[PDB]
Design a protein around this ligand. Structure first.
Ligand SMILES: Nc1ncnc2c1ncn2[C@@H]1O[C@H](COP(=O)(O)OP(=O)(O)OP(O)(O)=S)[C@@H](O)[C@H]1O
Ligand SMILES: Nc1ncnc2c1ncn2[C@@H]1O[C@H](COP(=O)(O)OP(=O)(O)OP(O)(O)=S)[C@@H](O)[C@H]1O
Ligand SMILES: Nc1ncnc2c1ncn2[C@@H]1O[C@H](COP(=O)(O)OP(=O)(O)OP(O)(O)=S)[C@@H](O)[C@H]1O
Ligand SMILES: [Mg+2]
Ligand SMILES: [Mg+2]
Ligand SMILES: [Mg+2]
Ligand SMILES: [Zn+2]
Ligand SMILES: [Zn+2]
Ligand SMILES: [Zn+2]
Lengths: 628, 48, 228, 547
């Protein structure tokens, strides 16, 4: 037939029209022609290149643009829009033949090609779906809330007869309904036939709950939700909590005896997803060369610190501590017996309104594995490990908590002072031995909790006191204060010049944020940080020894002079650990004397800031050589 | 990995890792059972 | 006919992905597994295992043709072996028996054992000697009147922060055949002493755990002993 | 064929939810009620298509009378069996279906009774015209729905036996019969839905002005040209309250609010203004909240003790011990893009305070209970009334000493209004005269410059404007923030609470609200100065005993 004759319809509906064999083979021929000959008048066929790429990477998905099919064969685009199931089946057979022409043995390897329609023009929200959209193609936006596990769904079903024992040839399984068998062809009987899963072929199946994104929801109304079924190649592509656009067939669930609660013949609906599009710390070979180029620069550490938290103004010491915590040191197990922690723990103790929460959020966006937890609030991952039974599923799960989940990563704890006893024991154990022991519900085990910790806390009474020292200013007991490497005390002393630039920064953010209206870019910095944590592992040599013992001996006796809380071995280890993170920002295999001096500066500045006002003025002049 | 299991692994030997969270009690399955007809008294054995 | 029928043992296990590598917003995913005969009772819950098995199919009476996956266990490998009185081994080969006898004939066995205790800790030689004495224990006495005399040695280390007493506790935890390291208030989800709770399925009393009981016949290292 | 629906409206009488009687079943009738829960729009089997199981020929356009039916005619001559069919969902014809749950209105509730609910079904174009938390008038038919719940109720329940009098039988051998229960509950099927205002008496301004007629646009613009419009507005807020002009200013700015801004990072800047009123007992703090809930649209009034964490944000509800779970919106969702009035905030326990400040920072409500995972909007302003520790407000202590609320509660309030009771002869004399005059004269002792209807019209007009800062405005704002910080630095402990950056952001928000009050698109430095003065006299100086 012809395209104009395809536009005219003889059957009652479009589905029965496409169902006719002459019309179906005409559609298949026209779709094969369109797949073969289509070009953008640039001398290149995009679909031939796509077929070659999917053949070379061994993929069962062919991404087909809807605009290309619409401009060339408008009636076929209309047929795909209104009756997508059988149209997609036909064009899947067409694309399978097109791939077969390119690769002859691709059929025995895969035997299935799924066509993913891209750039469907009309976009529906979840609240405006009606029955007119049923059995039609729809493109909707939404945020994924939860996803099930991947299940095997029958694809090529193979049966065996109980009377004879013979295995009867495979049948394709429709995804819409269950298929059954009534004849044996060997016994010529209608006897009981059993499915054997050994010879049956399966495809992946997943269910995803999609809700309307809260920004698009009208004010008084609730966000609507739908169930989206993801097939074999589409499973586990959408992490819960991310916003996607799904194109698929809007259809009805079939359930026994409908719904007895309503009193009306009411059907549940789903979206059978044809395609998923999303609205990664992988570096290429060129990106590694660019990393070496930017790390060769002398002011790489200054530039990294300045790139820390662009929304935060004027807090250079906090940004330096964040840079050390993100880059981290080298954990070392010497001869098996003795273990030394190699990740920096930072505690931001500050008065309210000092933007600690924004810093924690920046670290969460920046770090590879960052887990946010809070002592005061409830809508967060808990810090304590547990074994819990689902009240619906009746199936137990072991959760390690935020500290175990942030293993080889970052744990960001907001409201550090407001914990209960169980959380305090959990973070105490995690900072003590980097593990969490659980003996509950028959499970006795130890989970690895080698997580760097960045915490935010407030002083007692809502304001820091300079005359009192650090231990009196917090409810935190001394052993949990000792485990932190960097202790950033932040107070907003009223200085007119500082308040002027801070207010100017806030107002300029407000003005640029209005709808009617040196730093490394963050995408590059994120991969640079991930590369440094897994590739460098800086080391130090034996001739650098004579200086660190020199300064540390000059440290402790000064702490003897004023009677403050002492410099222990932990301060020396914090010096040697922070220096291994400064050599990671330089991407250097050795730890230099300049990185070591900068680490000494950070540790001494954190020690002096933690003192009372009487001790601080004496300690500042004695260590002015190290602070510079 | 447990979440990288696929329909391509169905009815095939897989090597995989994890933590065991529960072990049930031991059930008793029949390997050899001798059976007798109720009224016929025909005696048969089934080996599993 | 049950008196002439034969039976074996079947066990259901549940394997979960390790909680260290789980997406933050997702419940960890698990699988039901079946073992039989000599593969049963070879693993306790909490053990990290490698498993060779058949990824298999069953139908449970959410999709027209959906099957729940499960594993028929063919082999279990315990990556690490937990230490307790029940899992302790009493058998000794002849070569290690003779090798340990060559240790006892050394007049400086005491010195080399004290030097082997925490080599990366400077000083505290008396504490290291006391740790050697604590690790051995003493002769236990059971008397004809029934009054039991203990032989285990308890050692307290009071002192200033940053003096490697916690590292000594960790080293004793590592070197002891059976050892549990906890704080005074216990662990994150493992209590101190003994916990007697009810069975999660049958509601009957059982011993959930505890530091001092799990390390029976061993050493309990209690850090921050004052806060309890 | 197109499905046509007739919607009747303007019935002479509207019936209360408790006036529903069995005599009106199958009759056109009007009810009013508060929408508490709404369901997803679902397809309903209107005209089904079946195939006979052994004929295997298609039939269509079989009408469905409520519960699911199958035909017994089968005009195909192939079969001799009527009962056996199967239904295909693809060829079937469907309709819009929504079940919305409505509740008795507060004034309609009898003296000691609890409110009772009713499930009303919307079909066709009437779906989604009902929203949780508003008062709707439904016109439709009173229908009856099968109910298995009434099994254990006392009284004789009607049953339905098949009559066997004209059936010839033989006792040939080889006596079972089927009986079904007739138990029902009354439901409503509404053809027309109209939303009455939740008050006693759409973002684009071009859309809003088209709804008003030209004559009412004339008084709207006439209020616009008034040079003393701010004084009229602040005097028209809560005329029952005598004095307290600063609280009326703050409440007017809360009803106007600020603009919601989002940066390139993705963080959201809150435009809602939160007010907390603290002070001595019987200083008319509850009068402000009762005025706001009765006046402002999409506003709820809650007590601190009577509230719950699920009742304030959202609750997952078990229904009829059935496997389905539902979500009912809490107080902050019912007041989304409105004001939630929380009286006796100090009496609220710590868990509910945590659950509500989570919505105060995040502007959202997270649900992870049971099998329901959802994020809901909570873009609501908060007007709270609190009592200090010990009843009286202590002059010696700070603001944090008097209040039992958490620091996350206290930091997010833009304005704290401390109303102190001082016994002076004059002010007590005019206050007593005003209150007794209210009791004597009822409505005509209230003389606002603007009526409630025109005030709501002006506020709805003013909310369409989105003010922007000017070049001089930014510099004046920075200088005002520096003056605030220097004043606290000089005051030390004499200040009630210290100015941080959050107070600068609240001053920006208040300046935007003031610019909305005067219906200007650009913020004047005078408006910033007025916001500065309001925030300055919001803070009171702490008295210190002499040494
Ligand atoms: N130096 C700064 N640079 C930029 N913004 C700042 C700065 N200091 C404060 N802010 C702003 O002030 C506000 C403080 O909010 P949060 O950081 O959430 O509160 P916080 O600092 O965590 O203190 P809490 O929560 O009361 S203990 C935010 O809007 C910040 O953007
Ligand atoms: N003599 C030492 N030799 C080697 N490392 C030492 C020595 N003294 C302290 N350290 C190190 O100092 C760090 C502090 O650990 P510990 O001293 O064990 O903590 P602790 O302060 O003794 O325990 P507390 O009292 O509960 S805080 C560890 O990294 C030790 O390796
Ligand atoms: N300034 C005022 N103008 C008019 N009526 C007032 C004024 N102050 C008090 N009243 C009346 O005194 C009574 C106080 O009622 P409320 O508003 O409940 O007091 P309150 O300020 O909320 O104090 P608490 O916290 O409830 S004890 C009411 O009858 C008010 O009408
Ligand atoms: Mg904060
Ligand atoms: Mg210690
Ligand atoms: Mg009151
Ligand atoms: Zn057969
Ligand atoms: Zn027999
Ligand atoms: Zn028929």
């Amino acid at each position: 037939l012809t395209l104009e004759s395809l536009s005219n319809v003889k059957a009652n509906s479009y589905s029965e029209w496409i169902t006719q064999p002459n019309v179906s083979r005409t559609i298949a021929r026209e779709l094969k022609s369109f797949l073969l000959e289509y070009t953008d008048e640039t001398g290149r066929s995009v679909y031939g290149a796509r077929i070659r790429t999917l053949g070379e990477m061994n993929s069962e998905s062919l991404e087909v643009n809807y605009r290309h099919l619409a401009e060339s064969k408008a009636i076929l685009a209309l047929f795909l829009a209104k009756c997508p199931e059988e149209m997609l089946k036909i064009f899947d057979l067409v694309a399978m033949e097109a791939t077969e022409l390119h690769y002859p043995d691709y059929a025995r390897i895969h035997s299935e090609i799924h066509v993913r329609i891209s750039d469907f023009p009309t976009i529906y929200s979840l609240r405006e779906l009606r029955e007119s959209n049923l059995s039609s193609l729809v493109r909707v936006t939404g945020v994924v809330t939860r996803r099930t596990g991947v299940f095997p769904q029958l694809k090529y079903v193979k049966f065996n007869c109980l009377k004879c024992g013979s295995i009867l040839g495979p049948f394709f399984q429709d995804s819409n309904e269950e298929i059954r068998i009534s004849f044996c062809t060997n016994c010529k009987s209608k006897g009981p036939f059993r499915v054997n899963g050994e010879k049956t072929v399966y495809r992946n199946y997943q269910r995803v709950t999609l809700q309307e994104a809260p920004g698009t929801v009208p004010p008084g109304r609730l966000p609507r939700h739908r169930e989206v079924i993801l097939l074999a190649d589409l499973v586990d592509v959408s992490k819960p909590g991310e916003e996607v656009e799904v194109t698929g067939i809007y259809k009805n669930n079939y359930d026994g005896n409908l719904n007895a609660k309503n009193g009306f013949p009411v059907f549940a609906t789903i979206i059978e997803a044809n395609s998923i599009k999303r609205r990664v710390f992988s570096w290429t070979e060129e990106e590694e060369r660019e990393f070496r180029k930017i790390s060769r620069d002398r002011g790489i550490i200054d530039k990294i610190i300045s790139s820390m938290a662009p929304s935060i103004y004027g807090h250079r010491d906090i940004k330096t501590a964040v840079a050390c915590s993100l880059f981290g040191g080298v954990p070392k197990n010497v001869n098996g017996k003795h273990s030394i922690r190699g990740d920096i723990n930072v505690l931001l103790l500050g008065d309210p309104g000092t933007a600690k929460s924004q810093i924690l959020k920046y670290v969460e966006k920046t770090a590879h594995r960052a887990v946010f937890a809070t002592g005061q609030g409830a809508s967060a991952v808990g810090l304590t490990a547990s074994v819990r039974k689902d009240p619906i599923t009746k199936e137990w799960t072991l959760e390690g908590g935020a500290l175990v989940l942030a293993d080889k990563g970052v744990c960001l704890i907001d409201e550090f002072d407001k914990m209960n006893d169980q959380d305090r024991t959990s973070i105490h154990e995690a900072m003590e031995q980097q593990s969490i022991s659980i003996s509950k519900a028959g499970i006795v085990t130890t989970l690895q909790a080698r997580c760097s910790i960045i915490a935010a806390a407030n002083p007692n009474g809502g304001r820091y006191n300079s005359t009192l020292p650090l231990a009196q200013n917090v409810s935190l007991t001394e052993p949990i204060l000792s485990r932190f490497d960097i202790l950033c005390v932040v107070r907003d002393l009223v200085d007119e010049e500082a308040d002027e630039r801070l207010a100017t920064f806030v107002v300029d953010s407000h003005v640029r944020s209005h709808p009617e209206n040196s730093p490394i870019p963050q995408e590059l910095l994120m991969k640079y940080i991930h590369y440094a944590r897994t590739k460098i592992y800086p080391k130090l040599h034996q001739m650098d020894m004579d200086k660190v013992s020199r300064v540390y001996a000059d440290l402790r006796r000064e702490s003897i002079s004023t009677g403050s809380f002492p410099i222990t071995v932990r301060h020396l280890e914090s010096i040697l650990r922070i220096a291994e993170s400064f050599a990671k920002m330089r991407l250097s295999e050795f730890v230099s004397s300049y990185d070591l001096d900068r680490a000494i500066k950070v540790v001494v500045d954190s020690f002096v800031d933690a003192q009372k006002v009487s001790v601080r003025r004496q300690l500042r002049r004695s260590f002015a050589i190290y602070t510079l | 990995p447990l979440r990288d299991l696929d329909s391509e692994h169905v009815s095939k030997i897989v090597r995989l890792s994890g933590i065991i969270i529960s072990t049930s009690v031991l059930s008793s399955r029949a390997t050899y059972l001798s059976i007798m007809c109720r009224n016929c008294r025909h005696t048969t054995s089934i080996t599993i | 006919i049950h008196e002439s029928s034969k039976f074996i043992d079947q066990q259901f296990l549940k394997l979960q992905e390790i909680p260290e590598l789980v997406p933050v917003g997702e419940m960890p995913r698990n699988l039901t597994m079946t073992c039989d005969r000599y593969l049963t009772n070879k693993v306790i819950p909490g053990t990290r295992v490698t498993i060779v098995g058949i990824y298999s199919i069953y139908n449970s009476k959410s999709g027209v043709a959906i099957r729940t996956p499960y594993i028929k266990i063919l082999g279990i490998q315990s990556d690490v072996e937990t230490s307790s009185i029940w899992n302790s081994v009493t058998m000794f080969t002849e070569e290690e028996e003779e090798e340990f006898l060559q240790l006892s004939r050394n007049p400086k066995l005491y010195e080399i054992l004290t030097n082997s205790i925490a080599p990366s800790i400077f000083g505290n030689e008396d504490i290291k000697k006391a740790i050697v004495c604590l690790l051995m224990g003493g002769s236990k006495k059971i008397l004809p009147d029934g009054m039991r005399l203990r032989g285990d040695i308890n050692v307290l280390l009071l002192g200033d922060p940053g003096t490697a007493k916690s590292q000594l506790l960790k080293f004793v935890e590592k070197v002891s055949p059976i050892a549990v390291y906890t704080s005074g208030k216990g662990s994150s989800a493992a209590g101190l002493t003994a916990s007697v709770q009810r069975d999660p399925m049958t509601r009957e009393f059982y011993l959930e755990g505890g530091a001092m009981v799990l390390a029976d016949g061993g050493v309990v290292c209690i850090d921050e002993f004052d806060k309890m | 064929e197109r499905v046509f629906q007739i919607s009747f409206f303007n019935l002479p009488t509207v019936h209360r939810i408790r006036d529903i009687r069995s005599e009106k079943i199958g009759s056109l009738l009007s009810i009013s009620g508060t929408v508490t829960r709404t369901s997803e729009v679902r397809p309903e089997l209107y005209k089904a298509s079946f195939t006979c199981d052994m004929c295997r020929a298609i039939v269509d356009n079989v009408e469905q009378s409520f519960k699911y039916t199958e035909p017994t005619f089968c005009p195909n001559p192939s079969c001799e069996n009527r009962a056996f069919w199967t239904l295909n969902v693809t060829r079937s014809r469907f309709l819009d279906w929504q079940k919305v749950r409505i509740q008795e209105n507060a004034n309609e509730i009898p003296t000691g009774s609890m409110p009772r609910t009713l499930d009303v079904i919307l079909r066709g174009d009437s779906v989604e015209r009902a929203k949780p938390g508003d008062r709707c008038k439904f016109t439709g038919v009173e229908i009856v729905v099968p109910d298995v719940t009434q099994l254990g109720l006392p009284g004789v329940k009607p049953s339905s036996t098949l009559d066997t009098r004209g059936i010839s039988k033989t006792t040939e051998g080889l006596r079972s019969l089927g009986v079904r229960d007739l138990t029902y509950k009354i439901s409503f099927l509404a053809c027309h839905v109209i939303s009455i205002g939740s008050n006693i008496g759409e973002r684009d301004q071009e859309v809003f002005l088209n709804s008003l007629s030209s004559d009412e646009i004339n008084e709207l613009k006439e209020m616009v040209k008034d040079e003393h419009i701010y004084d009229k507005l602040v005097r028209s807020i809560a005329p029952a309250v005598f004095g307290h002009e600063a609280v009326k200013k703050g409440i007017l700015l809360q009803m106007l609010g600020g603009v919601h801004k989002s940066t390139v990072e993705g963080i959201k800047l809150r435009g809602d203004i939160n007010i907390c009123v603290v002070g001595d007992p019987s200083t008319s703090k509850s009068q402000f909240l009762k005025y706001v809930v009765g006046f402002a649209p999409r506003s709820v009034y809650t007590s601190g003790k009577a509230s719950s964490a699920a009742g304030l944000t959202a609750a997952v509800v078990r229904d009829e011990e059935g496997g389905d779970y539902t979500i009912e919106a809490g107080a902050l969702m019912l007041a989304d893009n409105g004001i939630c009035c929380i009286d006796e905030f100090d009496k609220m326990d710590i868990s509910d305070q945590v659950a509500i400040h989570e919505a105060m920072e995040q502007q959202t409500i997270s649900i992870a209970k049971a099998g329901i995972h959802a994020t809901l909007n909570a873009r609501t302003s908060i007007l709270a009334a609190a009592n200090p520790v010990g009843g009286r407000y202590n002059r010696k202590l700070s603001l944090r000493g008097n209040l039992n609320m958490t620091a996350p509660i206290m930091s997010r309030f833009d304005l704290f209004f401390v109303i102190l009771d001082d016994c002076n002869e004059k002010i007590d004399t005019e206050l007593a005269s005003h209150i007794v005059d209210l009791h004597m004269k009822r409505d005509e002792a209230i003389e606002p410059p603007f009526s409630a209807e025109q005030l709501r019209r002006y506020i709805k007009y003013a909310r369409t404007f989105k003010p922007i800062l000017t070049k001089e405005a930014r510099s004046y704002l920075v200088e005002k923030y520096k003056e605030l910080r220097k004043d606290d630095a000089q005051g030390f402990s004499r200040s009630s609470y210290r100015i941080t950056v959050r107070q600068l952001e609240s001053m920006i928000r208040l300046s935007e609200a003031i610019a909305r009050a005067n219906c200007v698109d650009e913020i004047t430095p005078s408006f910033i100065a007025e916001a500065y003065d309001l925030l300055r006299q919001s803070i009171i100086r702490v008295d210190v005993d002499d040494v």
